[PDB]
Structures are given as structure tokens and as C-alpha cells.
């Protein structure tokens, strides 16, 4: 009962950007956190963005703070990856991701417990 599901990937030239998107069902966004993770072949993996809810701050990589923005649109219960001055090494399959009550407000990759099927970005 609990999804997310991904929408906004593609592929574009360098400069531009794409939006993802995250619609949320069963549960209120506005109680939990997201967060965004991308992969990609001989890379690792790496968390990308987060969103808190107990103050709605964010935070990021490095490699993307700056250029990257996660919100929430408590209305339409669904998270944004706002993605501008898309670069080459941007290219990855982003994941986004649900914690668990117990880790929302708790920083780091632990206690994840649901995730998205994945959308491909592509800068060409």
C-alpha cells in the first residue's frame, strides 16, 4: 500500500535540466522523509538529496549542491528532484526513497525502507 513511483527522466544536453518527480501513496509526505540516490555502471552509488520533515531543510552531495533542488508539494503529496546545470557525470539511474519514522529526522543512507523503480538521466 505504501508506493512510490517516479516520473520526469530522459535524456538532454549538457546545461539543461529535467525535473524527477515522486508521487507518494499511503502515507503523508509531509511526515516522512525522501530522498533521492543515483547508480551507475562503474561508479558506486551515492546519496544524492534528502529532504527533513521535522524543519523541511535539505541537504546534498557535493556534486550536485547548487544545481540540485528536493522539495515536497504537501498538496499533491509527491517530491521534486529539481535538476539544473545538468553535467556529463549527472548520467545515472535516481532512485527515490522513503525512511522509516525512526530515521527521519536522522541523517545518512540508514534506515531507508522504501524505494522508487528507478529513472534514467541521461546528459548526452
Known amino acids: 500500500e505504501v508506493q512510490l513511483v517516479e516520473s520526469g527522466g530522459g535524456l538532454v544536453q549538457p546545461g539543461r535540466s529535467l525535473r524527477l518527480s515522486c508521487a507518494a501513496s499511503?502515507?503523508?509526505?509531509?511526515?516522512?522523509?525522501i530522498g533521492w540516490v543515483r547508480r551507475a555502471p562503474g561508479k558506486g552509488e551515492e546519496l544524492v538529496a534528502r529532504?527533513?520533515?521535522?524543519?523541511?531543510?535539505?541537504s546534498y552531495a557535493d556534486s550536485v549542491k547548487g544545481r540540485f533542488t528536493i522539495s515536497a508539494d504537501t498538496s499533491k503529496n509527491t517530491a521534486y528532484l529539481q535538476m539544473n546545470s545538468l553535467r556529463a557525470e549527472d548520467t545515472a539511474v535516481y532512485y527515490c526513497?522513503?525512511?522509516?519514522?525512526?530515521?527521519?529526522?536522522?541523517?545518512?543512507?540508514?534506515?531507508?525502507?522504501?524505494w522508487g523503480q528507478g529513472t534514467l538521466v541521461t546528459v548526452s
Open positions: 499511503g502515507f503523508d509526505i509531509a511526515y516522512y522523509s
Open positions: 526513497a522513503r525512511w522509516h519514522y525512526d530515521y527521519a529526522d536522522w541523517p545518512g543512507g540508514y534506515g531507508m525502507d522504501y
Open positions: 529532504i527533513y520533515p521535522s524543519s523541511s531543510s535539505t
